[PDB]
Design a protein around this ligand. Structure first.
Ligand code: CLA
Ligand code: CLA
Ligand code: CLA
Ligand code: CLA
Ligand code: CLA
Ligand SMILES: CCCCCCCCCCCC(=O)OC\C(C#C[C@@]12O[C@]1(C)C[C@@H](O)CC2(C)C)=C/C=C/C(C)=C/C=C/C=C(C)/C=C/C=C(\C)C=C=C1C(C)(C)C[C@H](OC(C)=O)C[C@@]1(C)O
Ligand SMILES: CC(=O)O[C@H]1CC(C)(C)C(=C=C/C(C)=C/C=C/C(C)=C/C=C/C=C(C)/C=C/C=C(\C)C(=O)C[C@@]23O[C@]2(C)C[C@@H](O)CC3(C)C)[C@](C)(O)C1
Ligand code: KC2
Ligand code: KC2
Ligand code: KC2
Ligand SMILES: CC1=C(C#C/C(C)=C/C=C/C(C)=C/C=C/C=C(C)/C=C/C=C(C)/C=C/[C@@]23O[C@]2(C)C[C@@H](O)CC3(C)C)C(C)(C)C[C@H](O)C1
Lengths: 194, 193, 179, 183, 47
């Protein structure tokens, strides 16, 4: 397939590209680069989502008040289930969180001029947005071999994390989906913005 | 004639074609290919049904449950005839859907049997070659490749045996059902089946 | 069949197939037979060792199988079929689901499949995580494969002996009447 | 003894659409021969538009029975009743957005004579391909034929869901269960 | 509903009367759609 030189072939699928439906053969190398970039974004967002979900369930929260006008505090938001926390956030707070995320997305599309869809894209590469990825230079000590290993670890952890966040968010609403009997927190599996 | 070049001729009717009514003589060759394909499909379905009906008549069933409320023994209790009615609806739908998949995939092969391909030779991998569809490559017939050990003459003799057994089962399963419907029509069947 | 492993000195240094089942087997059929034999050996060895350890008054796991449902490993029963029945249905479901995911991964992730020109009954996914037989010689590895097959067949015999002793009241001579 | 019969129907003559370079042109299904009267490029544009709309609509219809926007006013699993139940402003905004899209995409090309004046204009090729599947020319024929067939099946399917809900008064899969229920 | 074959029999035997005398001509002419007044009034479309 076109997804042969692309990194991502794992230890659990032999060492061959796992494309049973042949979507990588569909479309252009630009389309496959879009698929890779979407995969890595879903990976990363899923890792962040599962960490935030664990934070919400544990109840660890920032000390202070989210908004002094409405009087809502991190503690009052923590009282709700993890998905209800988003509904509990102030509307302007959600608006500016989405504004920050949108600005990051726009800069990722814009300032990374060799585009992921375009030739020489490096679809996973968002470094170039200076001091965005790895502000502490932790990856600087590593070399190409360890960097490739850590990229593969990123891909594996992120695929597992998106499966996990879907599982935990669908477990309570869809009983009997995940066999482990434990009081998964209530609330909707999907929420709208604002 | 295509009817003169098959394996179904058997000494039970002499060394000659069994076409009493000239059905094969009154049709073109394409219909003869269709006839052989349908004959073998009927025979194979019939022997599956015959052994299954004997198993049901013996009240033999798996240890477990066919659903969450019914037991295999419970649904087999009345007998082979009412067993299909007593099967749950979703299971019947699933059997029919998988049979639909089989008889669509086997039909969708371009050599075919009506249009220049071996009649009765179901493509061993029906779901392979289908774009955007994936199957585990469990080849439909001979999943563990018994016939590979045989020579060409051996498997020709066994194809003749297939035709004979399929015809016999064609008779047998209908004998079972007719004996159930009309009591005493087939005296070999007890009241159990 | 004459070139495969499993034969030992205990049958004339020769194959044991009285009923001709290998004569109707091609290379792929023989590979399937070997894969099934090895997987049965593995499953039976684990099963018989677990059954012996549990029903022989061996150590049991420390605490609660289900902290919420209230089932201690001691209270499970220390009897094979009874303990399996007393295990929660969710526990059985997730054991079987994990084994099913492992089986699907095994079928889809061991390239040259064992039925398409691959070694029968090898799982690179699950074998020697640490280092154990990644450096052994190709004759001692064959010897230990033969040992695997032998005592695995013995384990098949033993586990079905336990099953027969459980169902048939006293069918095995030197096994208790409450298996 | 028809010299040039329709491929779909050997007992009818070849329509103009059969002798054409459109995707799916090798079927010749036109018993009423509306390809002779209607411009084939316009007709294919409309075909693809209706297919796209209805293959959005079928998924919307089946998934509106099960899923809801959280706390959306006037939800009803029966979409026919749910249209009236929902706010009129929602549908007004949707129609306005689709009007904007159609106007901007077919600027100065709203009519048979006006559209397809430029030779490069292809039926259904409104330039919508963000992921650039069409750059790979090997799969373009597959994707075009697939779009056409799935759009056709979706037009038919949406008609089916709409009229089944009209018949039964219940949503799609509720009526399906009632059909596949106990005697 | 009764899916024929899935949750019900397939072809079902029909109900029949074991022979009988000839019905009089006026018995079925007075109910026929073309040679009866009520038959003609009932032989119309519906919607
Ligand atoms: C939405 C997230 C997402 C995306 C965009 C991709 C994208 C990709 N994966 Mg996949 N992958 C994912 C999630 C995703 N993956 C998950 C969760 C797993 C399971 C753990 C895998 C496991 C996996 C493996 C093991 C491999 C890939 C590979 C690939 C590449 C080739 C296949 C292809 O063209 O897929 C395109 C697919 C899509 C555009 C997504 C369609 C999704 C449908 C519409 C819905 C699915 C719903 C689901 C059933 C619930 C491609 C970059 C191969 C690779 O990296 O080769 C180098 C490869 O070997 N993936
Ligand atoms: C190892 C973990 C695990 C286990 C053991 C299970 C177990 C179960 N899940 Mg699953 N599930 C898991 C992870 C797991 N899930 C995850 C991570 C997710 C989130 C993505 C889900 C999402 C999920 C949903 C949404 C649902 C289940 C359901 C089920 C049941 C499936 C029973 C069945 O038909 O088996 C399948 C057994 C097989 C042998 C089939 C495998 C082979 C393939 C599919 C055959 C080919 C298909 C082809 C079209 C024909 C069972 C309780 C269902 C449920 O609630 O039931 C009560 C259900 O609706 N699960
Ligand atoms: C899962 C069961 C199983 C399977 C699949 C096999 C498979 C195999 N065995 Mg066998 N074997 C088994 C259990 C099994 N064995 C057990 C428990 C023993 C101990 C008595 C042996 C002892 C044994 C020896 C000593 C030898 C083999 C050999 C073989 C191979 C060639 C013969 C053949 O075609 O057998 C196919 C077998 C089957 C398909 C199973 C049929 C089971 C029947 C129908 C019922 C059994 C009766 C009763 C319930 C017990 C083949 C790989 C030979 C070998 O390794 O050659 C290189 C050989 O010399 N086996
Ligand atoms: C066929 C394999 C098999 C099966 C079906 C079972 C089934 C069972 N075992 Mg286990 N067990 C096994 C092998 C198996 N065992 C083996 C090889 C050992 C080592 C001796 C044990 C040691 C063991 C102990 C110490 C205990 C159980 C117990 C149990 C019960 C609870 C589940 C559990 O803890 O599983 C654990 C299963 C494993 C760790 C085996 C995994 C094998 C490989 C790695 C996969 C259940 C009846 C409990 C009991 O006694 O209940 C009465 C219990 O406390 N088992
Ligand atoms: C979608 C619903 C559905 C399903 C799943 C089935 C399933 C079945 N029907 Mg069928 N049947 C249905 C609707 C359905 N029917 C309808 C709507 C009618 C009215 C026309 C019939 C009329 C009917 C009769 C009269 C009989 C069956 C019988 C059967 C069984 C024999 C299968 C067979 O010979 O297939 C053959 C099918 C084909 C060769 C393909 C035809 C359909 C494709 C899509 C065209 C099977 C379980 C038989 C039975 O009861 O067996 C015990 C039987 O005698 N069905
Ligand atoms: C476990 C691992 C899986 C392996 C499975 C292998 C597998 O299944 O292989 C499947 C398989 C195979 C195989 C091989 O590949 C193998 C393994 C090795 C290879 O070298 C050779 C081949 C072959 C390729 C074939 C199978 C064929 C079958 C099933 C044929 C079935 C056929 C049933 C019939 C005729 C029933 C007939 C009923 C009748 C006549 C009923 C009746 C009656 C009576 C009542 C009795 C008496 C009455 O009389 C009176 C009234 O007086 C007359 C009549 C008519 O009313
Ligand atoms: C079987 C059953 O029934 O249930 C099972 C299965 C089921 C249902 C799926 C379940 C689930 C959910 C699961 C499994 C969820 C998994 C979630 C997952 C796997 C989440 C990863 C997050 C990773 C993050 C945030 C990493 C950031 C890491 C960052 C930002 C780094 O800096 C990395 C770093 O390397 C650099 C780049 C440079 C180095 O110099 C320094 C380090 C090393 C720090 C259950 C219920 O739990 C259990
Ligand atoms: C993407 C992350 C993010 C960034 C980068 C960012 C930056 C800045 C800057 C500097 C540029 C200023 C000067 C500023 C000021 C205020 N932020 Mg703000 N903020 C972010 C996130 C949130 C969230 C989640 C909330 C929030 C809020 C408030 C309130 C309270 C108002 C009130 O009393 O209602 C005030 C005064 C809360 C809110 O909007 O409440 C309605 C609330 O919940 N912010 N914020
Ligand atoms: C050869 C035909 C065939 C195939 C290929 C096939 C495949 C699969 C697959 C994988 C692709 C899954 C995942 C699956 C799952 C379930 N099947 Mg199923 N199945 C087939 C046949 C039957 C029959 C006859 C019955 C049945 C059933 C169930 C139930 C039980 C639910 C319950 O406990 O009620 C569940 C969950 C029973 C049923 O419908 O019960 C209402 C029932 O009688 N199946 N089945
Ligand atoms: C090899 C198979 C296997 C694996 C790989 C595996 C993995 C994981 C993971 C990580 C991936 C987590 C996070 C997890 C969690 C829980 N497991 Mg589980 N588990 C396996 C087997 C069993 C069995 C046999 C039982 C069981 C149970 C529970 C309970 C219930 C606690 C309670 O209710 O007190 C919880 C929370 C018990 C149960 O559900 O009892 C009703 C039970 O008997 N597990 N399990
Ligand atoms: C050919 C082709 C394709 C195709 C196709 C397919 C599958 C097409 C399918 C078309 C299909 C499936 C068309 C159904 C019509 C049904 C109608 C009109 C029903 C009317 C029903 C009526 C009027 C019912 C009326 C009543 O109920 C009323 C109101 C009350 C009752 O008292 C009386 C009755 C019961 C009478 C591809 C593969 C998709 C792409 C390819 O490229 C080209």
């Amino acid at each position: 397939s076109a997804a042969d030189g692309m990194e991502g072939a794992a230890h659990e699928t032999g060492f061959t590209t796992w494309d049973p439906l042949g979507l990588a053969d569909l479309g252009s190398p630009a389309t496959l680069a879009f698929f890779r970039h979407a995969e890595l974004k879903h990976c990363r967002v899923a890792m962040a989502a599962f960490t935030g979900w664990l934070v919400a369930v544990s109840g660890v929260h920032f000390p202070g008040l989210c908004s002094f006008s409405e009087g809502i505090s991190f503690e009052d938001i923590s009282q709700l289930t993890p998905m209800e926390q988003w509904g509990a956030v102030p509307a302007l707070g959600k608006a500016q969180i989405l504004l920050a995320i949108g600005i990051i997305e726009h800069q990722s599309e814009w300032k990374i001029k060799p585009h992921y869809m375009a030739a020489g894209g490096k679809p996973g590469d968002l470094k170039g947005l200076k001091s965005f990825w790895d502000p502490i230079g932790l990856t600087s000590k590593m070399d190409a071999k360890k960097l490739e290993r850590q990229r593969l670890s990123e891909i594996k952890n992120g695929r597992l994390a998106m499966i996990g966040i879907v599982s935990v968010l669908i477990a309570n609403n869809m009983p009997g989906a995940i066999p482990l009997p434990i009081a998964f927190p209530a609330g909707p599996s999907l929420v709208l913005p604002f | 004639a295509l009817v003169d070049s098959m394996e179904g001729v058997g000494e039970e009717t002499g060394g000659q074609i069994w076409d009493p009514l000239g059905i094969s003589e009154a049709v073109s060759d394409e219909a003869v290919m269709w006839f052989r394909a349908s004959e073998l499909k009927h025979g194979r379905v019939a022997m599956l049904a015959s052994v299954g009906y004997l198993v049901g008549a013996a009240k033999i069933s798996f240890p477990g449950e066919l659903a969450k409320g019914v037991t295999f023994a419970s649904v087999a209790a009345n007998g082979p005839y009412q067993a299909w009615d007593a099967v749950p609806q979703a299971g019947k739908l699933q059997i029919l859907s998988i049979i639909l998949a089989l008889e669509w995939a086997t039909e969708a092969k371009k050599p075919h049997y009506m249009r220049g391909g071996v009649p009765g030779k179901i493509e061993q991998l029906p779901f392979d070659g289908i774009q955007g569809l994936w199957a585990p490559k469990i080849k439909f017939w001979d999943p563990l490749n018994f016939t590979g050990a045989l020579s060409a003459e051996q498997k020709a003799r066994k194809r003749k045996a297939e035709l004979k057994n399929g015809r016999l089962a064609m008779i047998g399963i209908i004998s079972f059902i007719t004996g159930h419907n009309l009591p005493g029509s087939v005296p070999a069947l007890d009241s159990s089946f | 069949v004459s070139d495969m492993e499993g034969t030992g000195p205990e049958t004339g240094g020769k194959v044991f197939d009285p009923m001709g089942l290998s004569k109707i087997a091609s290379a792929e059929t023989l590979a399937w037979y070997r894969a099934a034999e090895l997987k049965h050996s593995r499953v039976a060895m684990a099963a018989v060792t677990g059954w012996a350890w549990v029903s022989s008054g061996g150590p049991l796991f420390p605490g609660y199988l289900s902290v919420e449902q209230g089932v201690t490993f001691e209270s499970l029963g220390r009897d094979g079929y009874a303990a399996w029945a007393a295990v929660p249905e969710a526990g059985k479901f997730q054991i079987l689901g994990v084994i099913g995911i492992l089986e699907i991964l095994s079928e889809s992730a061991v390239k040259p499949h064992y039925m398409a020109g691959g070694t029968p009954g090898k799982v690179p996914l699950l074998w020697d995580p640490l280092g154990f037989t990644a450096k052994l010689s190709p004759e001692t590895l064959a010897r230990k494969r033969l040992a695997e097959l032998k005592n695995g067949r013995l384990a098949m015999i033993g586990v079905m002996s336990l099953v027969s002793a459980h169902f048939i009241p006293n069918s095995v001579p030197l096994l208790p009447g409450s298996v | 003894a028809i010299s040039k019969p329709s491929n779909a129907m050997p007992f009818l003559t070849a329509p103009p659409c059969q002798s054409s370079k459109l995707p799916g042109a090798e079927t010749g299904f036109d018993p009423l021969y509306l390809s002779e009267f209607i411009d084939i490029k316009w007709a294919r544009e409309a075909e693809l538009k209706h297919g796209r709309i209805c293959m959005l609509a079928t998924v919307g219809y089946i998934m509106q029975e099960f899923f809801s926007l959280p706390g959306y006013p006037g939800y009803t699993p029966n979409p026919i009743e749910a249209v009236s139940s929902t706010p009129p402003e929602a549908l007004a905004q949707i129609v306005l957005v689709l009007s904007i899209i159609e106007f901007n995409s077919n600027k100065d090309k709203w009519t048979m004579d006006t559209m397809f004046t430029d030779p490069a204009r292809e039926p259904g090729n409104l330039g919508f391909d963000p992921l650039k599947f069409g750059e790979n020319k090997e799969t373009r024929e597959r994707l075009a034929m697939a779009e056409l067939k799935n759009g056709r099946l979706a037009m038919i399917a949406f008609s089916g869901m709409i009229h089944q809900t009209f018949v039964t008064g219940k949503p799609l899969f509720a009526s399906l269960n009632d059909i596949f229920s106990s005697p | 509903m009764t899916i024929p074959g899935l949750n019900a029999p397939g072809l079902v035997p029909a109900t029949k009367k074991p022979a009988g005398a000839k019905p009089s001509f006026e018995s079925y002419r007075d109910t026929s759609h073309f040679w009866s007044s009520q038959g003609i009034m009932d032989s119309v479309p519906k919607v």
